[PDB]
Design a protein around this ligand. Structure first.
Ligand code: NI
Ligand code: NI
Length: 258
């Protein structure tokens, strides 16, 4: 709770507390769409969110986390590059100060206005805390946001943010359907990587959807009204909470589509 996104505590500093920041499988990365190899071996991706059950939303001083009840076999990601089954625990976003930046992954160096991360843990390790200690512990579905038409399924999120403005505030947040945040297509890129915030663990199979979602300007402007600070400290708007692209280091990015 000293790391952040600023000049003196941002991404270029994180390696001091977290040496893995300079590791061999760090995220995000630029997705070079011409270099990515179509992989006919990938099985169909399966997103089964019909029983997802949200519990709460928290401003953690970095982003806001929508946390789900993951105590039962509900809200599962499987197939694609995955072996076994991964359970949804939370989602969050990364976004910019301006529409021209905000995403963590880039596509041929293109930055989107924001990116959504749906975080799932491998059920073979029994819970999230043990899964993050394993190289195949997590599967994160990444979805790019562009500014245009509103996303009606985002509006419940946008409307609770005024209740969690500052670091440490949380609220009850039930019956949120994450299916309303998906694009039409499940075409994706996949590669082995890491968490994009400290502790930067190399435990993620990344699945980045090719098709962005559209959100309105007014929706992302409400993201940018959150605060990094806690109440009673100077106001610092919660913007630019994205780590830039890291070295690919001879990993391969595979495409699900030709
Ligand atoms: Ni700290
Ligand atoms: Ni993230």
């Amino acid at each position: 709770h000293h790391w952040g996104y600023g000049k003196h505590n941002g991404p270029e500093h994180w390696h001091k507390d977290f040496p893995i920041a300079k590791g061999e499988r760090q995220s995000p990365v630029d997705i070079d769409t011409h270099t990515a190899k179509y992989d006919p071996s990938l099985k169909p991706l399966s997103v089964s969110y019909d029983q997802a059950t949200s519990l709460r939303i928290l401003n953690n001083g970095h982003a806001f986390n929508v946390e789900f009840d993951d105590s039962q076999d509900k809200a599962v990601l499987k197939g694609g590059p995955l072996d076994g089954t991964y359970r949804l625990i939370q989602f969050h976003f990364h976004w910019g100060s301006l529409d021209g930046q905000g995403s963590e992954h880039t596509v041929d160096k293109k930055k989107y206005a924001a990116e959504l991360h749906l975080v799932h843990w491998n059920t073979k390790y029994g819970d999230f805390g043990k899964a993050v200690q394993q190289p195949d512990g997590l599967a994160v579905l990444g979805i790019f946001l562009k500014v245009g038409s509103a996303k009606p399924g985002l509006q419940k999120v946008v409307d609770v943010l005024d209740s969690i403005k500052t670091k440490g505030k949380s609220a009850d947040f039930t019956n949120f359907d994450p299916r309303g945040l998906l694009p039409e297509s499940l075409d994706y890129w996949t590669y082995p990587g890491s968490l994009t915030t400290p502790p930067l663990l190399e435990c993620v199979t990344w699945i980045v959807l090719k098709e962005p979602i559209s959100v309105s300007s007014e929706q992302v402007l409400k993201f940018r009204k959150l605060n990094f600070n806690g109440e009673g400290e100077p106001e610092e708007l919660m913007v630019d909470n994205w780590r830039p692209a890291q070295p690919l280091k001879n990993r391969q990015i595979k495409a699900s589509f030709k």
